[PDB]
Structure of Zinc finger protein 57:
Amino acid sequence: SERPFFCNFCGKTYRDASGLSRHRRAHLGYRPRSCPECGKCFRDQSEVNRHLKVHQNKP
DNA sequence: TATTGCCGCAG
DNA sequence: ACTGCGGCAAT
Ligand SMILES: [Ca+2]
Ligand SMILES: [Zn+2]
Ligand SMILES: [Zn+2]
């Protein structure tokens, strides 16, 4: 139940370093991976990949 | 100590 | 529909 990782600007706590890494980068606006179709930026390639289905033609 | 893929939760 | 989020496992 321990959440020993925390943000130095707002104090939000995390179970492990990954949640903190992502949270810090979200404060920074660090979104280095982009959708090749529309240019929208995301934190990582997994998030880009999940976004791609926006560009399918809807049923 | 670090980063992301996968995954589920929630709005 | 779309995506912000974050725990876990792996690296
Ligand atoms: Ca969760
Ligand atoms: Zn914070
Ligand atoms: Zn796109």
